[PDB]
Every structure is written in C-alpha cells, then in structure tokens.
Design a protein around this ligand. Structure first.
Ligand SMILES: COC1CCN(c2nccc(Nc3cc4n(C(C)C)c(C)cn4n3)n2)CC1
Ligand SMILES: [Cl-]
Ligand SMILES: [Cl-]
Ligand SMILES: [Cl-]
Ligand SMILES: [Cl-]
Length: 317
C-alpha cells in the first residue's frame, strides 16, 4: 500500500512554565487568545507568541477540533502560512502560535485605509497567493480563506491562518459534505454552496473575494443581501462590483476567480505571476488618491527585550 506520503511533522509539547500570558488579544466561544512570551528551556531566547487557550471548553468535540487545527498548523512550513510552535497539555489545552502583532488584514485595511498605497495592496495579493499555492502543493484545501483569516506580522508581511475548516485533498473522497459547516457563503464558490464540493479552485474563488475586500478597504461582500440569495445571484451571473481603485486589469482577475467553471479560474501559481507583474508598476494597476505619499511602519514597540527573537528566526533543529 502507498497512497500519500508520511507526515513527519513534529508536534512540540511545551511546559506551562516556559511561557507567560501578558494581555488578552481576543476571545470567543472557541476560548481566549493571549499575547505572551515563550522562553524555551535553556535557550537564551524570548519568542513573542499568541497563546490560544480553549478556556475550559471541556467539550470532547471542541478538544478534538482544536487538535485538528493543531495538526494542520504543525504540518505547514511556509513564510506566508502561520505555523504552530507547540502545544501545552494543561487542563484546558493551549496552542502556542506566532504573535502577529498588527492583527488581521481585514481590520488593518479598515483602520489604515488613508495610508495604504497600491504597492502594499498588490504585495499582499502576491503573498496570499504564495501561501495558498503552498497549501495546494501540500494538497490542503483551506475552505475559509477571507481577509479576516490573513494576519499581519508587519505591514510588509502577511500570513494565512485559520485551519479549522482545512481538509487534505485525498482524505476519503468525502468532498460532498459539510466538514466544519457550510457557512462562509459569501466567500464560497458556487459549487461549494450548492453541492459542498471543495477544491483548490474553490479557494481561488475565496481568494477573489479576499482581494475584493482588500481593494475596497474592508467592505463587506454582498452587503445587505442574505446568504440565501447568493447562490441564485451567482447562477444569474451577477458578481461583486468593480472597486473604485481597481483598473479593469485587476478587476478582470477577480472576475476570472468567480467563473462558474472551476477549471476556467486561474491557478494560484498564475495569480502569483500576474500580481507580481502588477506590483512592479503599482500606479498603473490601482488608482488611489495620495498614493505617491503613503507611509506604513515596519518596527514595533516592546520592557527589556535584548534576547527577543521572532518565531521565524527560531528554527527547531
Ligand atoms: C479563532 O482563533 C484563532 C485566532 C488567532 N489565530 C492565529 N493563528 C496564528 C497566529 C496568530 N497570532 C496572532 C493573532 C493575533 N491577534 C488577533 C487576530 C487575535 C492579534 C491582535 C495579535 N495576534 N497574533 N493567531 C488562529 C485562530
Ligand atoms: Cl517577506
Ligand atoms: Cl464598494
Ligand atoms: Cl476605475
Ligand atoms: Cl489569467
């Protein structure tokens, strides 16, 4: 027998005493994300982390789901994908992840709109396409790509997250079912809404919507339309409108991601190519008032911090 290659990823189990929670970054019914610092055993290193604790969500189903997330996050290794650093098996389990201090890309474009230039937008499109192409190479279909699920390490460096709907293409044929729900309808390809089919090319659709969110500075897709209508809207041939800043060049690429025929949508590798050409001449592809004059940061705050290392530079041997 041989059908798929062995996943030789390492799951690191960390002690409670190696790390400290400093502030809360957010909470839902999934638990609590804390901003923290991880200091590995014997290493003269301080790594800023996000610690996602289940928060006493002692459902055995929720424990299974968050360990499924942990499985995928421990298995990925790419500059544009969030990796898991380790787990801690306290009473409520804790996932230890990299701190992405500027938050989600969605909230970033909403907050910083008047200071984001075309170079940033087009580079973010390249980076998400690189991270999605990596997931495709690993045979992973993400199933929840959206600007909320892209995080910002620096304004110059984004990564995809949220692996709690992700499925391996090659996982028992059952790609006609509501794995993790069937709920992000406004980002979903039509075949996923109607049939529960999911593919790399259905993530291309969601990529198109994600780009549309970036180019509209965080506007809600199909705002005011209930999710019940979306399928019929798409079957009748309507799509999201051309964002004001977008040339027909950029918008036609979005439109191509929303073709009914999945195989006529672009591949992630081609989206990398196309957005990279556009990123060499940004003002030709997005028209933004003030573009010539924009300035986003690169460093951070941080309080004695001499041995701080970012997780991307702390490579496990
Ligand atoms: C929904 O449950 C989790 C939210 C956080 N998520 C995740 N993955 C990898 C790294 C990572 N790092 C991070 C997340 C955040 N936030 C928000 C967005 C909470 C702020 C303000 C700073 N950081 N740093 N987060 C995974 C899913
Ligand atoms: Cl980079
Ligand atoms: Cl709009
Ligand atoms: Cl225009
Ligand atoms: Cl193309």
């Amino acid at each position: 027998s041989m059908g798929e290659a062995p996943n030789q990823a390492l799951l690191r189990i960390l002690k409670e005493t190696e790390f400290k929670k400093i502030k809360v970054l957010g909470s839902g019914a999934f638990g609590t994300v804390y901003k923290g610092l991880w200091i590995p055993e014997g290493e003269k290193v301080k790594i800023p982390v996000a610690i996602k604790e289940l928060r006493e969500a002692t459902s055995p189903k929720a424990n299974k789901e968050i360990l499924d997330e942990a499985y995928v996050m421990a298995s990925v290794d790419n500059p544009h994908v969030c990796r898991l650093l380790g787990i801690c098996l306290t009473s409520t389990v804790q996932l230890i992840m990299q701190l992405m201090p500027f938050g989600s890309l969605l909230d970033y474009v909403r907050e910083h709109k008047d200071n984001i230039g075309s170079q940033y937008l087009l580079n973010w499109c390249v980076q998400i396409a690189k991270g999605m192409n990596y997931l495709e190479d690993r045979r992973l279909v993400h199933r929840d790509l959206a600007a909320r699920n892209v995080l910002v390490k620096t304004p110059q460096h984004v990564k995809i997250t949220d692996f709690g709907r992700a499925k391996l293409l090659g996982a028992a044929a059952a790609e006609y079912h509501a794995e993790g729900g069937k709920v992000p309808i406004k980002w979903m390809a039509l075949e996923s809404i109607l049939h529960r089919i999911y593919t790399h090319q259905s993530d291309v659709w969601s990529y198109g919507v994600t780009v549309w969110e970036l180019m509209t500075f965080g506007s809600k897709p199909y705002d005011g339309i209930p999710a019940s209508e979306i399928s019929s809207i798409l079957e009748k041939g309507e799509r999201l409108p051309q964002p004001p800043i977008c040339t027909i060049d950029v918008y036609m690429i979005m439109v191509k991601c929303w073709m009914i025929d999945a195989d006529s949508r672009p591949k992630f590798r081609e989206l990398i190519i196309e957005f990279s050409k556009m990123a060499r001449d940004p003002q030709r592809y997005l028209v933004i008032q003030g573009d010539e004059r924009m300035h986003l940061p690169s460093p951070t705050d941080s309080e004695d911090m001499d041995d701080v290392v970012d997780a991307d530079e702390y490579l496990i041997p």
